[PDB]
Write a protein that binds this DNA or RNA. Structure first.
Lengths: 311, 310
DNA sequence: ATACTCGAGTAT
DNA sequence: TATACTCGAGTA
């Protein structure tokens, strides 16, 4: 009856299975290896460039490698934002005095090894963002397939076009269209619906993963649904990012209610553990959350998407 | 209102750019200190791996198999979900996809890959170190508060996991905070015990800071429960506060159910404007009992003096 | 800006 | 030991 009751019969219907977790970790590793090559090649290139220095101090004169030297000195690009030029030069001198000179004849590999060791945290950062985008793509693929299977045309917004205004008609074969869709728009029963991802919602003044608008492809009454989408596969992060999402959804509910609005709210997650599953179920029963789906379970995702399209 | 002793406005909670810059510099210093064992393991891996004349030969050096798996793109966290065959397969992919194609440079290909992936491991280690150091800073503030007030205390060594050997404060407790899992004292007849990272029975969740009405379950023995965030990254400020807020809500919810109203606190090193407004609102409404910005000594001292007198 | 992406470790 | 803690590497 209730939307979620179509694909959820018990609390643990929401729980991610052991096989789904192993599959996710394997796919994450495959993508990590695919993404790794440019990092190793940049390290190979750095060694070629740095190798013209005959002494660690000589590295200070190869302007082409100074950013790499700052990185190898233990400064992430996130940290670099907070350092003055002096701090940066000092960090590089520390690398030269504390590690490169002491490595003596092995100073070039000392540099390359440190540059890779710290760049590994950068690749890790990149991979966490990649996992997020792939999750969004998976949900979009489920949404457009649901429209396609129902013979409902739609328009889409290309994430590459930052004016984010040119709504294009669905191509004949929308194979992999989800790779670049920032939003999807359709009409069902006369009503126009526009789904957008990662939008700043003015009433809460916070970004929201999923937003469904009552409007042909800001005005609080136009928000039909707001939802959080967690594509992480790590069970150790399941409750962590659910605690985060729950405050996000409460900020939403609080601000909208103040205005007399009750938009629908949803939570979709690939890593769902027992405790958090109990809380999601309680919220669905109490009406505080409108629907939910475990992203690794096709039938749930499909049911939720068909429901979304008909809202 | 306890918090009014050290907070006059919402922005008194906000971290300054100078404290952020100082935090980032201190994190980098610690990272460089912790980096050496990683590079040395890479040097040692190269020495051991060098015996192989071909990438396939690496499969026979039993001593490097774990490093091979790691270099193949498998974090220790992911490793837990892999079967032995998954692992074998991962290592073969490394051999076929990267080491054979590197030809003559195959050993460095392996070492470079081992380090690149191990960098995420060092990042993991550093995030946990940052947390521990934040806990130590708060403990230092608490023991100094007791010392300056001439109040003895006993302490629990985090070093042996038994967590039962409560010891008398030493004459000089210099750096005692480095290994204290808990601190216990008596003030005006009341016995108080502070413990860190305890699983709290009623919520069935871990809590950063617990104050017990008990000399060194029983949900009613809980005087205070608090969240402590030692992160210095402003980009993680709202993120970890959103998390903390659900943790504190679960606490309030489960305890009220039982007719209990333990005090609650939030201490954070990275506090931004938006979350500062929400913390301020909760302090004003009585939902949150006290708060302090960990980078501001006067706030931390005022909060710790208040904690000791609860 | 401002606050999003999520898993690298860790502990009880 | 099942469970959930640590926090910043990126990103927009």
């Amino acid at each position: 009856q209730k939307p979620f009751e179509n694909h959820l019969k018990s609390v643990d219907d929401l729980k991610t299975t052991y096989e789904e977790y192993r599959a996710g970790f394997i796919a994450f590793a495959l993508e990590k290896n695919k993404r790794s090559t440019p990092y190793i090649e940049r390290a190979r290139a750095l060694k070629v460039a740095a190798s013209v220095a005959k002494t660690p101090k000589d590295l200070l004169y190869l302007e082409d490698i100074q950013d790499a030297l700052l990185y190898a000195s233990g400064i992430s690009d996130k940290a670099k934002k907070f350092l003055t030029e002096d701090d940066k030069k000092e960090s590089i001198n520390n690398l030269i005095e504390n590690f490169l000179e002491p490595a003596g004849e092995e100073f070039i590999d000392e540099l390359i090894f440190r540059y890779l060791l710290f760049q590994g945290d950068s690749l890790g950062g990149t991979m966490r963002n990649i996992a997020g985008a792939l999750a969004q793509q998976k949900l979009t693929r489920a949404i457009i397939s649901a429209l396609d299977i129902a013979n409902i045309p739609y328009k889409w917004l290309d994430s590459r076009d930052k004016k984010y205004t040119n709504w294009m008609d669905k191509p004949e074969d929308d194979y992999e269209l989800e790779t670049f869709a920032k939003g999807i728009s359709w009409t069902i029963n006369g009503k126009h619906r526009t789904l957008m991802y990662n939008i700043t919602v003015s009433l809460v003044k916070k970004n929201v993963d999923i937003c469904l608008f009552n409007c042909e492809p800001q005005q609080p009454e136009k928000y039909l649904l707001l939802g959080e989408l967690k594509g992480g596969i790590d069970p150790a992060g399941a409750d962590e990012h659910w605690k985060t999402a729950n405050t996000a959804l409460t900020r939403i509910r609080n601000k909208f209610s103040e205005k007399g609005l009750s938009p629908k709210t949803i939570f979709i997650g690939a890593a769902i553990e027992h405790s958090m599953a109990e809380e999601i179920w309680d919220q669905l029963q109490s009406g505080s959350l409108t629907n939910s789906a475990n992203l690794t379970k096709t039938e749930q995702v499909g049911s939720l998407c068909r429901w979304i399209i008909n809202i």
